[PDB]
Amino acid sequence: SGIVQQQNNLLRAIEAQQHLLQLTVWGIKQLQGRGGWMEWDREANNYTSLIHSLIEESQNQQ
Amino acid sequence: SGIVQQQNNLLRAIEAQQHLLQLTVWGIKQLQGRGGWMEWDREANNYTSLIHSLIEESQNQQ
Amino acid sequence: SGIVQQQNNLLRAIEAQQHLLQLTVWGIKQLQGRGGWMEWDREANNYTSLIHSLIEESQNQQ
């Protein structure tokens, strides 16, 4: 709603995106089996859903 | 210019970055031909240019 | 501290994340040796540390 609340929302979104970014950096390093990627997939999907919720929330608060 | 306008700019930047982030997550999953990556390349490049414009705009608005 | 300062912090965080995002896009394109990835690793690690400092700073400023 307010400026502060929105600022906090944006920061949380950035924090979640950083976690996803770190997962991709790690994944690329590993590529330098499928089943061995199960946890990575789980995390990537969970953070993607988390970021989606954060963006929608931010959009709703203008 | 104002706080609200800047907040909206930052959100749009985050949204564009999320699209690019999703493209990289998808790309890594695919790596777990070249010609088959044409659309991915197109999208990655377009979002990169989009984000660049959004950042420059934000920088200009302080 | 203030709204403006926080807004600037968020923008710097987004800018740093964009650099890391570009590194991952580039890395995926290359994957479409290990030793040949030394500079990429160096940059990825440096930007990750840079973003970490920016997020912690933003968290500290609320």
Swiss-Prot record, chains A, B, C:
Compartments it resides in: Virion membrane; Host cell membrane; Host endosome membrane
Coiled coil: 42-62
Membrane topology according to the record: Single-pass type I membrane protein
Glycan-bearing residues: 46
Function: Acts as a class I viral fusion protein. Under the current model, the protein has at least 3 conformational states: pre-fusion native state, pre-hairpin intermediate state, and post-fusion hairpin state. During fusion of viral and target intracellular membranes, the coiled coil regions (heptad repeats) assume a trimer-of-hairpins structure, positioning the fusion peptide in close proximity to the C-terminal region of the ectodomain. The formation of this structure appears to drive apposition and subsequent fusion of viral and target cell membranes.
Description of how the protein assembles with itself and partners: The mature envelope protein (Env) consists of a homotrimer of non-covalently associated gp120-gp41 heterodimers. The resulting complex protrudes from the virus surface as a spike. There seems to be as few as 10 spikes on the average virion.
Name of the molecule in the record: Transmembrane protein gp41
Whole-protein coverage range: 546 to 653 of 856
